[PDB]
Design a protein around this ligand. Structure first.
Ligand code: KFV
Ligand code: KFV
Ligand code: CO
Ligand code: CO
Lengths: 140, 140
């Protein structure tokens, strides 16, 4: 089952400038920074709080590594802003299989690598009332 | 200081249908339901997790009460999807005054009523890299 908000994915043109905006305005600091060449993003995770399921909630700031990527395509069309929401689970494989069985489009056959060794999948936004929705299991 | 993700504001055309989608797909149940005639919304809050600052993280599903509202204007232009993100604080008045002093546009002179007796204000999206950003203090 989905037991937390894991993160909010926020697309930006300039990761360093957007990271500085969050630090200067809210005092949020960088927890981790990772490039995912498969997904085509450079990511900075800012930890906001721990959660009651033992995990944490982050802002995931995302700059595209290339125009030909989910995030580069999205920024060109929409401008900077919220790109996706992510829910955490102890078993992304099980929860993804259960959602697939309800007729919601799951974008991967098997969960893929996300940041900090996590395993992730996505649900099609047109099946989720316009919200690109990620499911996350932490490596721990 | 901002100590949690308080909620994700998600705009929808039909609150009851979108509430049912979240229940049926993820098992999330309705924590509260409130109409805010000032803001022009009918809201359902779905609690996802408790947080390390003593608060909680919700999905706030929002259907417009009228076309002439922040959310009715937004849905007409953008379709269903994420409308805003909200951060929690023990002192929205203090934190809003500090952000005003950095030159980020605060939309209210004084925090206004949000759901469940909360006090809220908003930061202009064009000052926050495209994210409409709410600050929330719970009534408790
Ligand atoms: C590393 C990691 C991350 O989270 S990095 C995140 C970057 N990765 C991804 O986005 C991968 C999954 N995303 C996707 O495949 C794309 O978002 C979607 C499902 C494929 C869309 O694929 P498409 O090839 O169709 O692109 P397209 O723009 O045509 O999208 C088709 C339709 O989906 C809508 N759409 C696309 N992106 C969307 C988004 N981010 N939110 C809402 N709607 C979206 C879009 O508006 C269009 O509908 P519309 O005609 O009514 O406007 N991590 O650690 O968690
Ligand atoms: C009850 C409660 C709730 O949260 S209910 C939430 C509903 N309330 C609100 O949204 C009130 C605060 N919102 C606002 O005042 C509006 O979102 C904004 C700041 C005023 C925009 O006001 P405007 O009169 O200018 O409308 P307008 O569409 O012209 O907005 C002007 C610019 O802001 C952008 N914008 C508007 N809404 C946006 C949003 N939700 N996210 C991102 N950008 C947005 C929009 O794209 C446009 O830029 P663009 O030209 O590049 O596209 N609670 O308990 O927490
Ligand atoms: Co993500
Ligand atoms: Co709100």
């Amino acid at each position: 089952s989905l037991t937390r908000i894991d993160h909010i994915g926020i697309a930006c043109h300039d990761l360093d400038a957007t990271v500085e905006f969050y630090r200067a305005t809210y005092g949020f600091e960088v927890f981790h920074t990772e490039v995912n060449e498969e997904q085509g993003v450079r990511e900075a995770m800012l930890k906001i709080n721990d959660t009651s399921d033992g995990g944490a909630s982050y802002l995931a700031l995302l700059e595209p590594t290339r125009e030909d990527s989910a995030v580069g395509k999205w920024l060109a069309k929409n401008g900077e802003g919220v790109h996706h929401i992510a829910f955490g689970t102890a078993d992304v494989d099980a929860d993804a299989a259960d959602i697939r069985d309800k007729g919601v489009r799951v974008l991967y056959d098997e969960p893929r690598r996300g940041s900090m060794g996590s395993r992730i999948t996505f649900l099609h936004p047109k099946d989720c009332h316009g919200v690109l929705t990620e499911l996350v299991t932490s490596a721990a």
